Amino acid sequence: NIINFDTSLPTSHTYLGADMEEFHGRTLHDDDSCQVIPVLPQVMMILIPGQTLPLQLFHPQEVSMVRNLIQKDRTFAVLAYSNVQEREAQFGTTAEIYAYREEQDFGIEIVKVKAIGRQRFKVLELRTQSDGIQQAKVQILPECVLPSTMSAVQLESLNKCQIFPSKPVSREDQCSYKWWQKYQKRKFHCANLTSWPRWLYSLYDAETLMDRIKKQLREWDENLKDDSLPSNPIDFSYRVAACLPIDDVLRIQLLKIGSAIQRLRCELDIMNKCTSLCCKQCQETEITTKNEIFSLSLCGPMAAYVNPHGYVHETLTVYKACNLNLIGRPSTEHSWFPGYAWTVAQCKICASHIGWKFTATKKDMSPQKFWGLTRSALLPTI
Amino acid sequence: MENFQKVEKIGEGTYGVVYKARNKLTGEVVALKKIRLDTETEGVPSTAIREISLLKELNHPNIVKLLDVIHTENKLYLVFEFLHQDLKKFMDASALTGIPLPLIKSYLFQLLQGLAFCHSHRVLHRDLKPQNLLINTEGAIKLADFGLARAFGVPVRTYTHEVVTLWYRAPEILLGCKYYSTAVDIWSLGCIFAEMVTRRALFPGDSEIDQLFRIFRTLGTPDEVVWPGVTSMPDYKPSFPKWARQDFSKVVPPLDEDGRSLLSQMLHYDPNKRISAKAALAHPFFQDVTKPVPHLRL
Amino acid sequence: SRGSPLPVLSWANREEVWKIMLNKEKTYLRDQHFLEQHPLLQPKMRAILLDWLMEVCEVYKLHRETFYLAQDFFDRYMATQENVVKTLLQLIGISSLFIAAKLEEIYPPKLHQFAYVTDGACSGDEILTMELMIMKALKWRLSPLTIVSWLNVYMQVAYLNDLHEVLLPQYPQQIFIQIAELLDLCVLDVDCLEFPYGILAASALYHFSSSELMQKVSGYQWCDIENCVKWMVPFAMVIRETGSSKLKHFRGVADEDAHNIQTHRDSLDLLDKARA
Amino acid sequence: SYNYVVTAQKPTAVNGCVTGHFTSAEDLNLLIAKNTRLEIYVVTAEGLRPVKEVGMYGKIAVMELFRPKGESKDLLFILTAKYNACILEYKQSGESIDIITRAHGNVQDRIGRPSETGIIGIIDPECRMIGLRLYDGLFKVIPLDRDNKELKAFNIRLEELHVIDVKFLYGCQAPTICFVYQDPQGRHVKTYEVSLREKEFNKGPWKQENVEAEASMVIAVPEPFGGAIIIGQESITYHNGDKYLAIAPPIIKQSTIVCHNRVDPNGSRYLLGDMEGRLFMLLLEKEEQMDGTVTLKDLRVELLGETSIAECLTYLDNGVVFVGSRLGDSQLVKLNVDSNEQGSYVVAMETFTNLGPIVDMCVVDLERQGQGQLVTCSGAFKEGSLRIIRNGLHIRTVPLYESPRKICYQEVSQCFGVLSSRIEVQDTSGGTTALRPSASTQALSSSVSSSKLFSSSTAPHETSFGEEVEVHNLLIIDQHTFEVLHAHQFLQNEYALSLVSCKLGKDPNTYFIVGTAMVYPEEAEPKQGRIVVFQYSDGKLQTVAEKEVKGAVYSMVEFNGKLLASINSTVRLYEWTTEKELRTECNHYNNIMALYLKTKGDFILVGDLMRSVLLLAYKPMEGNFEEIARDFNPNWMSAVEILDDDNFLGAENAFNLFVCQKDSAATTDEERQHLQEVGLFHLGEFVNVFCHGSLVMPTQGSVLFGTVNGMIGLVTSLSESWYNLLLDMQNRLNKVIKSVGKIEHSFWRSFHTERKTEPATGFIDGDLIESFLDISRPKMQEVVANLQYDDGSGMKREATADDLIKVVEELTRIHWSHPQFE
Numbered sequence A: 001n002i003i004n005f006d007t008s009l010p011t012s013h014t015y016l017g018a019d020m021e022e023f024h025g026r027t028l029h030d031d032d033s034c035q036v037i038p039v040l041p042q043v044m045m046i047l048i049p050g051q052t053l054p055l056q057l058f059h060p061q062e063v064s065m066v067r068n069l070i071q072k073d074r075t076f077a078v079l080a081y082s083n084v085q086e087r088e089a090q091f092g093t094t095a096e097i098y099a100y101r102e103e104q105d106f107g108i109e110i111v112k113v114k115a116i117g118r119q120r121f122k123v124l125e126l127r128t129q130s131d132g133i134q135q136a137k138v139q140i141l142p143e144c145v146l147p148s149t150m151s152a153v154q155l156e157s158l159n160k161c162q163i164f165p166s167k168p169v170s171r172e173d174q175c176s177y178k179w180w181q182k183y184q185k186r187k188f189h190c191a192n193l194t195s196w197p198r199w200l201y202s203l204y205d206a207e208t209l210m211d212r213i214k215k216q217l218r219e220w221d222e223n224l225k226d227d228s229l230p231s232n233p234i235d236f237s238y239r240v241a242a243c244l245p246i247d248d249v250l251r252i253q254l255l256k257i258g259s260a261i262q263r264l265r266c267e268l269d270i271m272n273k274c275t276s277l278c279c280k281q282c283q284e285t286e287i288t289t290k291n292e293i294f295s296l297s298l299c300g301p302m303a304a305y306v307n308p309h310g311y312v313h314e315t316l317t318v319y320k321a322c323n324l325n326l327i328g329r330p331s332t333e334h335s336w337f338p339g340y341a342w343t344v345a346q347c348k349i350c351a352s353h354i355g356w357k358f359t360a361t362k363k364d365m366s367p368q369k370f371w372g373l374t375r376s377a378l379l380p381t382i
Numbered sequence B: 001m002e003n004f005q006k007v008e009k010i011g012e013g014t015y016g017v018v019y020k021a022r023n024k025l026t027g028e029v030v031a032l033k034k035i036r037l038d039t040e041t042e043g044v045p046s047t048a049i050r051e052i053s054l055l056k057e058l059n060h061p062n063i064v065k066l067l068d069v070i071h072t073e074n075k076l077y078l079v080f081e082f083l084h085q086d087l088k089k090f091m092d093a094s095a096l097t098g099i100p101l102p103l104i105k106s107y108l109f110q111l112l113q114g115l116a117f118c119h120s121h122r123v124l125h126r127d128l129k130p131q132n133l134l135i136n137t138e139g140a141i142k143l144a145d146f147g148l149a150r151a152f153g154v155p156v157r158t159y160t161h162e163v164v165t166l167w168y169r170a171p172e173i174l175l176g177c178k179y180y181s182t183a184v185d186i187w188s189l190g191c192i193f194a195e196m197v198t199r200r201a202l203f204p205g206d207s208e209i210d211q212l213f214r215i216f217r218t219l220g221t222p223d224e225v226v227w228p229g230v231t232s233m234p235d236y237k238p239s240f241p242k243w244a245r246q247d248f249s250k251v252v253p254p255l256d257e258d259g260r261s262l263l264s265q266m267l268h269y270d271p272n273k274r275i276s277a278k279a280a281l282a283h284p285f286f287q288d289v290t291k292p293v294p295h296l297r298l
Numbered sequence C: 001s002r003g004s005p006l007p008v009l010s011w012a013n014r015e016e017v018w019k020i021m022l023n024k025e026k027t028y029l030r031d032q033h034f035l036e037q038h039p040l041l042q043p044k045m046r047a048i049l050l051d052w053l054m055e056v057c058e059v060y061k062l063h064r065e066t067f068y069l070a071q072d073f074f075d076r077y078m079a080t081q082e083n084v085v086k087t088l089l090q091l092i093g094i095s096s097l098f099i100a101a102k103l104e105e106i107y108p109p110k111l112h113q114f115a116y117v118t119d120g121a122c123s124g125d126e127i128l129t130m131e132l133m134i135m136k137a138l139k140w141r142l143s144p145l146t147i148v149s150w151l152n153v154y155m156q157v158a159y160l161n162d163l164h165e166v167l168l169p170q171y172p173q174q175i176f177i178q179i180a181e182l183l184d185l186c187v188l189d190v191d192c193l194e195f196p197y198g199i200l201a202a203s204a205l206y207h208f209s210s211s212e213l214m215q216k217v218s219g220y221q222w223c224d225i226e227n228c229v230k231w232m233v234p235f236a237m238v239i240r241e242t243g244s245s246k247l248k249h250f251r252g253v254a255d256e257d258a259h260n261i262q263t264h265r266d267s268l269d270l271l272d273k274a275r276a
Numbered sequence D: 001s002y003n004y005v006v007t008a009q010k011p012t013a014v015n016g017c018v019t020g021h022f023t024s025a026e027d028l029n030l031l032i033a034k035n036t037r038l039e040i041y042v043v044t045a046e047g048l049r050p051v052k053e054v055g056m057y058g059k060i061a062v063m064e065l066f067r068p069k070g071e072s073k074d075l076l077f078i079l080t081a082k083y084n085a086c087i088l089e090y091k092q093s094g095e096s097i098d099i100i101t102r103a104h105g106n107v108q109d110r111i112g113r114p115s116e117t118g119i120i121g122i123i124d125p126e127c128r129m130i131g132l133r134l135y136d137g138l139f140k141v142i143p144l145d146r147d148n149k150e151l152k153a154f155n156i157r158l159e160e161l162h163v164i165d166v167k168f169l170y171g172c173q174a175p176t177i178c179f180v181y182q183d184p185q186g187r188h189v190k191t192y193e194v195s196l197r198e199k200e201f202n203k204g205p206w207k208q209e210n211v212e213a214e215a216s217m218v219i220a221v222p223e224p225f226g227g228a229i230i231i232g233q234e235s236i237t238y239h240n241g242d243k244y245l246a247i248a249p250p251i252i253k254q255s256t257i258v259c260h261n262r263v264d265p266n267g268s269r270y271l272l273g274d275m276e277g278r279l280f281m282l283l284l285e286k287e288e289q290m291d292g293t294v295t296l297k298d299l300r301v302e303l304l305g306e307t308s309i310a311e312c313l314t315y316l317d318n319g320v321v322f323v324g325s326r327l328g329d330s331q332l333v334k335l336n337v338d339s340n341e342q343g344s345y346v347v348a349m350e351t352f353t354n355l356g357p358i359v360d361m362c363v364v365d366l367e368r369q370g371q372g373q374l375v376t377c378s379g380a381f382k383e384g385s386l387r388i389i390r391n392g393l394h395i396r397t398v399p400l401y402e403s404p405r406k407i408c409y410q411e412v413s414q415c416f417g418v419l420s421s422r423i424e425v426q427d428t429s430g431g432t433t434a435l436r437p438s439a440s441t442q443a444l445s446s447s448v449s450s451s452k453l454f455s456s457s458t459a460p461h462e463t464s465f466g467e468e469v470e471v472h473n474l475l476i477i478d479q480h481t482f483e484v485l486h487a488h489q490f491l492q493n494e495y496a497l498s499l500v501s502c503k504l505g506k507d508p509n510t511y512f513i514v515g516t517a518m519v520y521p522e523e524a525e526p527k528q529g530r531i532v533v534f535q536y537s538d539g540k541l542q543t544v545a546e547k548e549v550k551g552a553v554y555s556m557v558e559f560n561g562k563l564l565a566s567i568n569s570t571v572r573l574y575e576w577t578t579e580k581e582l583r584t585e586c587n588h589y590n591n592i593m594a595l596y597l598k599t600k601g602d603f604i605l606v607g608d609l610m611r612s613v614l615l616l617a618y619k620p621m622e623g624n625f626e627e628i629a630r631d632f633n634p635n636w637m638s639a640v641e642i643l644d645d646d647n648f649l650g651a652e653n654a655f656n657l658f659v660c661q662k663d664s665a666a667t668t669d670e671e672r673q674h675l676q677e678v679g680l681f682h683l684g685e686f687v688n689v690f691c692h693g694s695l696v697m698p699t700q701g702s703v704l705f706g707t708v709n710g711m712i713g714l715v716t717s718l719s720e721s722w723y724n725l726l727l728d729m730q731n732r733l734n735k736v737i738k739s740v741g742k743i744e745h746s747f748w749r750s751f752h753t754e755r756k757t758e759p760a761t762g763f764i765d766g767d768l769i770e771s772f773l774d775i776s777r778p779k780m781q782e783v784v785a786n787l788q789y790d791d792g793s794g795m796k797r798e799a800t801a802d803d804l805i806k807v808v809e810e811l812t813r814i815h816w817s818h819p820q821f822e
């Protein structure tokens, strides 16, 4: 239904605290450059570029390493551990700190940090520092931007009518089914020179795939306008990738897709092929389906949050879930979504912690109840 | 605010965050509730203004004392008095052998005095749950977290509909009654009294209809004979299943006759004939009241 | 003396509720010479500001209790200040109402709405600042017995049938609006602050009732209110000559609650006749 | 893989044409560039005389003639697509003609992305500079000074990032560019001045004018008119600063005007053409004659006739117009003054052959006289045809008036199965009506598919009047008379994609198996299609079996007596049962869409547009497909082909061809699973279809390909010794042979992509090696000086420059002989 929640709070991570420093800095790296980068040992997250990762660090060397890595650069290597969880990391992502905070209060160090992923790398070596710190010597993978499929076969006399007037307002009659039908007939007119039809080349068109993905992205938490979902296909693909509830082995394969075109095709592939999200270690219960998936934040249906003990959870927000029982009573402590209280949810068969049930606690709040299901206990299906 | 030194996080109430701090001047332990006004678009939240305004007018041995209020830029601090625990953690720590009947007597007797003090001051707590009843090692239980409180007028008018936690929500509030009054708090105390004896929640429902059906199953389906006007209540439907007044001898075993009568009065369906706090303090159950000292490891 | 106007009570006992109400009346001090501390100000712009607040309440369907809470907040906040200009006055006024809003009605209008009502003269940050310093200056003592709450009490004690039943509203809806209309007309001038709020409501009740209904309902005696009645004469009169209004209806409000909403029609036009 | 690539037929699709005084100071010359060959004709009253033809190491993207001050002839400016430019001059010394490179250089920028609208090259009228629009946001100027022999150029920032078109204006003291561009609130036209001594942009002599939303052609009108003419979908407008004059005739509404030409030096009238292939004349009548000035009065346009879909137009004086086409045969026609034979003023009087967009060819031979016939599906739309190439070179054209997509040959029935597509319009009364009578509508016998298994009945979506629909037919064409003997029309919204003619299982009948996809404008990916088996027996075409599939049958092939087809992303092996039915036997599921799919022996090679190529094997006694290898890097792939059991050859973006190898080393079960690339080469052509067969009879194998630009090429395989010998010869020839524009052969044949560029490896250029016989004896003696031919056993060092002649001449006769221009 309607959502007057002001979905910016989940992205703000206000539960992490108040007096948080807000580094405006940025940094990059040359393509296929061998870099030596520090590693966080306890985070098991598979970070996708453009994703916000909040972390709470307790261990002394970790406090020290974040403290000394704040000044010289701000990047650390979140390795995407394979199914073999201990070591055996072949690829990963670089994350740069954009918010850092230190409180000696209560007599414990605790470093509260918010980072965001920038690049992807392959790890060629993994050395160990003097104090239980992993240094990954890595090579940056390339962002291979692919030219248009008619840039080679193209009549230069027709290459002058290849710009198109403009977008036809926003979702009107004879403005979605008609404008795209004339866009496909004018951008792929040289497809008659090749051995394939226009509708085949539309399947590999960045604009068409982005529009087709946005058609489904609107069903989850109808979008205000194209302010989100950047026009650049690389950024759009990385943003959509962070929202798919697929498991870890599929996420690794998606993160290895070099081109944006193949990444969009794979995301659009697992957007209608998937039918049901089911219990992972239990494998029998039908928890939810796609139809009840909705986004409560600008980041999308799924985002990364952190419990007071430092663990990072990818919580997918759904309207309705079944085969789950609640343990305990609602509490508003450290709540990821401000104004809601959580109750621990476990599956009916194997009593495995699957997520939480959030309920409204303040006055005049539109979604009276929803469910946040952790991704580590979900296995998408047929 | 440079005099207090934080020691540990306690928890979060209806709003803000509560810490434990020791005053460096007199060396006493207090609690500090913190509000971040910079995030609050509507300045100081309504709950904050309400609780601060009511808490400086209520001074009772069984209501948590508001020692001092300050404002340090973009932060609001309320200093409270320190209580060592809450009722819930004490009940959980005593889920095997349990709270003695004299201790339950003293706890309910002391809650009723604070509730009667609030009701004499035309104040509706509306948040009587075991998290908000704080106990100490001296054997005193006190009311806390007045954020959801409201000073009801004379006459009353319509206030906020869905109030109180679901497990402690009165049936008239569930049925969408137009006007509610003091009786709701009494109901909560009953729901807590039976909780102190049976050791689990009396009505553990995860939805409105559930809660209502569980209340009916325990106490029977109301009619116009016991509760005038149920058939005319906005949320009452004729399809409600007919259950018949499960005997209190099985619902709440370990307590005797006068306790059973008092609890049945505390769980009466109609607000008009539901027992008032003062007329509950006159019950024979409070004839041999004492003040035992709980031993509360952890 | 105030013997015991209120009947026997069930949810509490009558004596305690009554002495608590009287001690609340005693605790909140109000001064009719609070304007002399500010030589630039005059009673007329206080009346103008109160009327503007009345209009603001009427626009947003805020309750009468909200308006009178704002009035008490203003009249107690000015008495603790010195040498304020009229330009600030509007802000202070809205701030009081803004605070009063959060205290009384279920769904406050948002801060941006309150800023928009000021027509750009006051901003949201300014409103929050002034509300915070108001809450300091009143020492967070923000629960007074207003003029209209006393009127509600008196009206219920006026019309009682099956004893008790003091919490469920039961009284005609046109006498209440007439008496409140007299009370806000008497609220614009400063010297009304001389008399207690309960005495104000009682005398305004009498000016549309008999001398025995007042005494049965209010617990008061003739001498303590002779001055109040003698002073109110003009008000009651100008109102009687003008003719009382009718219980108007509001959108989104039940027909049994419309009498608890502020209705501003015209006051300054009658005050000058009253002061003549 | 030690390959050898040569061209058996030069490109025939003309991509640019220009006229001017190139050969001498007074004769009129026609210069036509097709892909890489520049052909110079001297136009005479009889027609065209082919004086010269040169070949360049690059794809001519822009070419114009210009005569700078103090010059007797016209100089030629050529910019190739690798972004290198050259200024050339014709000279003749008695009886020898060569193209001097007056200037040359490389123009590309280190950082920058190629513009979407494409390379635009313009030359200052009076020749003060050359303007190039190559990358978005910047316009680069080459000053045409007498000392800029290295073509040094500087870039001026363009504020408008989306520039549609740009031209140089006439009659301006400082050079002016008028350009139409787009901003996110409209499409505008505005001018700029170029300052060379200070190298920036100054305010132009007009005002920023808001123009038609589909304006796409700016042409510069010469004196005494001046100004510019803007041509778009709706109207033709004329701007000359203050003066504005627009007309919106209904005659040009049907099609989009794409090409234009100026047929009068005064600029009084122009020639233009559109996509549909009809020709208009744009008349500008002075009719003003003021006190001292002449201005425009109206801008009427008129129909002239129909020609071949035209890519370029030029006026060759005395009524004759050359129409250069990339989709069909080029034309040389004549515009009569008052012909009106039926309404058309144009009559064709010469046609130049154009193999065009070869989309699919087949090699047909039974007797070995020349042991070769190349039947290619050429052209598109009105001029789609099939071309039969024989060596006796005889090119025979069979016009279909519809686009041909796939062709396959049946020996027993002596017929060709041709997939064809026809464009129809939606009528008001409901139904499809044809534009022109095509081969599908003029067949001896006709049939329409009556399949009822495709009930569908899910949002039929009756289209709008004027919508374009595409009907697909299968044509049975005789192989002796080339007469369409049968046309079978497929169902509505059915795109025919694949066609094979092969025997299946244990029956002796040969079949035409076609794969189809039901395409709907809302469904991006087809979810239903058919596999249909036809028999052409004694005149008719009977459907023997029909099979439902849940997706598009992109490609399929006969495989050891079975079929194997690609349904979306699954590869399915069907076995043709005894009761004339097709039953599934094997399934494999891939992460990529199986577009290209070729088998040899028991190996299958699949691939998609994204160059990700997979290689599977069929295990006989287990009953499925086992993945052997697969290499996946993102790039656009046009065609793939399996050379031998180990080497696989494909064509990829930027007109490149590659060969990837299999196995070798085989260290740890991952080396053999990796398809490591071995060879790269820059063809310069977009190869479209890639088949086997020899067309004429030290090279083993012969795989020939057909491209978009009309080229036909042949790639064979050599050995270690001969690859080394010819690679050594290739470098020695590069130091003796001088190209047109001083373009290095290594740079021109370097594998190119706008992310990377590496030298060509594993490929030997047949054209450069065959150019050894066109060199002189004293120059031939420097190539072979310190060589080591080696044959019997000894290197015999010298090689005598007569032995390598024998080697190259033996290499020459593996393909057809190129006819001499003149």
Ligand SMILES: Cc1cc(S(=O)(=O)C2CC3(CCN(CC4CCN(c5ccc6c(c5F)n(C)c(=O)n6[C@@H]5CCC(=O)NC5=O)CC4)CC3)C2)ccc1Nc1ncc2ccc(=O)n(C3CCCC3)c2n1
Residues within 6 Å of the ligand: A306, A307, A308, A333, A334, A335, A336, A337, A342, A356, B010, B011, B012, B013, B018, B031, B064, B080, B081, B082, B083, B084, B085, B086, B089, B131, B132, B134, B144, B145
């Ligand atoms: C002295 C004294 C002691 C106790 S006590 O000990 O009884 C109490 C301490 C307690 C409070 C609750 N935590 C239990 C922990 C359980 C784990 N956790 C948590 C939270 C989120 C989690 C999570 C977790 F694990 N995980 C695994 C997750 O993944 N998430 C995510 C997060 C995001 C989300 O959205 N979803 C999720 O799931 C919270 C802490 C400590 C134990 C109980 C009571 C009172 C006092 N004294 C005292 N004196 C004076 C006053 C005066 C005024 C006043 O108001 N108060 C009190 C303030 C509050 C009530 C009244 C006073 N109080």
Ligand SMILES: [Zn+2]
Residues within 6 Å of the ligand: A279, A280, A281, A282, A283, A284, A285, A347, A348, A349, A350, A351, A352
């Ligand atoms: Zn389970």
